[PDB]
Scaffold this active site. Structure first.
Site, PDB file in Angstrom:
ATOM      1  N   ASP A   1      41.960  38.428  38.480  1.00 22.33           N
ATOM      2  CA  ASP A   1      41.068  39.070  37.437  1.00 22.33           C
ATOM      3  C   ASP A   1      41.665  39.973  36.398  1.00 22.33           C
ATOM      4  OD1 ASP A   1      38.388  39.734  36.680  1.00 22.33           O
ATOM      5  OD2 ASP A   1      37.755  40.647  38.246  1.00 22.33           O
TER       6      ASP A   1
ATOM      7  N   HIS B   1      33.446  40.267  29.567  1.00 16.59           N
ATOM      8  CA  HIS B   1      33.152  39.745  30.840  1.00 16.59           C
ATOM      9  C   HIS B   1      32.383  38.478  30.623  1.00 16.59           C
ATOM     10  CE1 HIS B   1      34.419  43.508  32.913  1.00 16.59           C
ATOM     11  NE2 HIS B   1      35.250  42.563  33.307  1.00 16.59           N
TER      12      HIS B   1
ATOM     13  N   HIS C   1      36.565  34.667  29.922  1.00 14.26           N
ATOM     14  CA  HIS C   1      37.079  35.299  31.247  1.00 14.26           C
ATOM     15  C   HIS C   1      37.142  34.660  32.449  1.00 14.26           C
ATOM     16  CE1 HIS C   1      38.332  38.974  33.309  1.00 14.26           C
ATOM     17  NE2 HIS C   1      37.397  38.672  34.341  1.00 14.26           N
TER      18      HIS C   1
HETATM   19 MG   LIG Z   1      33.702  41.164  37.655  1.00 15.89          MG
HETATM   20 ZN   LIG Z   2      36.137  39.398  36.378  1.00 12.24          ZN
END
Ligand SMILES: [Mg+2]
Ligand SMILES: [Zn+2]
Ligand SMILES: Cc1ccc2c(c1)nc(/C=C/c1cccc3cccnc13)n2-c1cccc(OCCCN2CCN(C)CC2)c1
Length: 306
Positions: free
Chosen positions: A212, A63, A67
């Site tokens: 995501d 993360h 990303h």
């Molecule tokens: Mg997140």
């Molecule tokens: Zn994320």
């Protein structure tokens, strides 16, 4: 000035930014410049904002800056293919919101923060890191010469926050399940209404989940490689649990790497595939996401089977 070769190649859904770390913060401005214009933000503000955002991505395994940009890209692809459907504001914010959705991530699920009374779980009783990722977002914006929405009317302003904010909270995967089972019904009942604001919110929120998770939607070498980094941050959280006695959940246990291929298979069939499915039902052009996800499902299948 980004190279012309990629100009076409970034518009693909399966585009991978990995080989272009050099270029990641340019690519964003690229994607900003192509969606909303070059006259969207004051050009100098927008570059300030971006590298400050970069600075505030810890050196975590997953993360992290890479990303935020990969997600960022995937939102680009979806909006380039749904041109007609999104306000001009939404677009702007949705890419901003994407680049910022994971600000100052420690490498630790909410359950970690909440089983260990972290302060963040004190501040943010639920959706702990997301309410924080919005926090960090505001603060960098309120750096001087970083506020890019100063361009807006205060009533357009407060709306790009509320888009940004909801999309940041929507990346809370625990909220995704409700959202997507709720959108399944609204589809099946013919009661989806693009003019209904909360209906838009849910759709935005599912787009944020598809974005995501988009690592599942890349070519198999890209996808398998990104998997190494997802568990390296998971297993790290596992580590801190044995040191504290509690055996971590399977997901987070370096001693159970061999069960990883089948765990991937079950994540796809219970999170990934339903998400891009409802995505394609609602936004038909987003289907190369679903189709790439299916390809990778076969792979994890083909990996379990030998
Ligand atoms: Mg997140
Ligand atoms: Zn994320
Ligand atoms: C040995 C093992 C066991 C289980 C594994 C596993 C490995 N890997 C996964 C999922 C890899 C995952 C998780 C998050 C994001 C990815 C993106 C791309 C690829 N993978 C992944 N899972 C898995 C997948 C989905 C659900 C799950 O347990 C049920 C709990 C559901 N959670 C899922 C997410 N949390 C935060 C809230 C709700 C476990």
């Amino acid at each position: 000035t980004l190279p012309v070769r990629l100009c076409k190649e970034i518009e693909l859904f399966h585009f991978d930014i990995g080989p272009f770390e050099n270029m990641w913060p340019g690519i964003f401005v690229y994607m900003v410049h192509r969606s909303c214009g070059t006259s969207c933000f004051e050009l100098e503000k927008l570059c300030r904002f971006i590298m400050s955002v970069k600075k505030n991505y810890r050196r975590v395994p997953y993360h992290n800056w890479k990303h935020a940009v990969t997600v960022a890209h995937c939102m680009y692809a979806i909006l380039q293919n749904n041109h007609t459907l999104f306000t001009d504001l939404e677009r702007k914010g949705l890419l901003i919101a994407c680049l910022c959705h994971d600000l100052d991530h420690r490498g630790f699920s909410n359950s970690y923060l909440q089983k260990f009374d972290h302060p963040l779980a004190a501040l943010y009783s639920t959706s702990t890191m997301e309410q924080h990722h919005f926090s960090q977002t505001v603060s960098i914006l309120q750096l001087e010469g970083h506020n890019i929405f100063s361009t807006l009317s205060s009533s357009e302003y407060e709306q790009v926050l509320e888009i940004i904010r909801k999309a940041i909270i929507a990346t809370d995967l625990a909220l995704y399940f409700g959202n997507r089972k709720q959108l399944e019904e609204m589809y099946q009942t013919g009661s989806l209404n693009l003019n209904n604001q909360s209906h838009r919110d849910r759709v935005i929120g599912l787009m944020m989940t598809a974005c995501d998770l988009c690592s599942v939607t890349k070519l198999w070498p890209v996808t398998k490689l990104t998997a190494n980094d997802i568990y390296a941050e998971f297993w790290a959280e596992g580590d801190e649990m044995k040191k504290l006695g509690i055996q971590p959940i399977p997901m987070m246990d370096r001693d159970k790497k061999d069960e990883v291929p089948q765990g991937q298979l079950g994540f796809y069939n219970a999170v990934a595939i339903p998400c891009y499915t409802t995505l394609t039902q609602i936004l038909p052009p987003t289907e190369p996401l679903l189709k790439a996800c299916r390809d990778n499902l076969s792979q994890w299948e083909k990996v379990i089977r030998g």
